Amino acid sequence: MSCPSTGLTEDILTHIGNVASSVPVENFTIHGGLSRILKTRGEMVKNRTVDWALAEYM
Amino acid sequence: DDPEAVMYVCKVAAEWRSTFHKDVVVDLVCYRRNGHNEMDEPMFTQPLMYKQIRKQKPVLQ
């Protein structure tokens, strides 16, 4: 028995991060405090770094 | 939100327990003015309930 490597190619990770750091429906209004959280998620995603919340999405 | 009925219900329950020696339940329907914790944000999940809450007077007034 053996286990394949669990890594992923980079473009999949970038696509997941970009979707996770935004609101993908039109006409939807969100709280300010939540807007800062999503913006910080994008901050990390563009720098190629993940916090604990982003790893669960990925 | 009407204290003068709360007092009567509590009095009646106290009399029932002495007269019949059974259990009795009193339900106080109210609301939660702040979030679950003092340092908490309740608008993330219940926006319209708390929009309605911050337009309502306290009972003491």
Swiss-Prot record, chain B:
It is found in: Mitochondrion; Nucleus. It comes from the Eukaryota. The mitochondrial 2-oxoglutarate and 2-oxoadipate dehydrogenase complexes (OGDHC and OADHC, respectively) share their E2 (DLST) and E3 (dihydrolipoyl dehydrogenase or DLD) components, but the E1 component is specific to each complex (E1o and E1a (DHTK1), respectively). Homodimer. The 2-oxoglutarate dehydrogenase complex is composed of OGDH (2-oxoglutarate dehydrogenase; E1), DLST (dihydrolipoamide succinyltransferase; E2), DLD (dihydrolipoamide dehydrogenase; E3), and the assembly factor KGD4. It contains multiple copies of the three enzymatic components (E1, E2 and E3). In the nucleus, the 2-oxoglutarate dehydrogenase complex associates with KAT2A. Interacts with ABHD11; this interaction maintains the functional lipoylation of the 2-oxoglutarate dehydrogenase complex. Belongs to the alpha-ketoglutarate dehydrogenase family. 2-oxoglutarate dehydrogenase (E1o) component of the 2-oxoglutarate dehydrogenase complex (OGDHC). Participates in the first step, rate limiting for the overall conversion of 2-oxoglutarate to succinyl-CoA and CO(2) catalyzed by the whole OGDHC. Catalyzes the irreversible decarboxylation of 2-oxoglutarate (alpha-ketoglutarate) via the thiamine diphosphate (ThDP) cofactor and subsequent transfer of the decarboxylated acyl intermediate on an oxidized dihydrolipoyl group that is covalently amidated to the E2 enzyme (dihydrolipoyllysine-residue succinyltransferase or DLST). This is 2-oxoglutarate dehydrogenase complex component E1. The gene is OGDH.
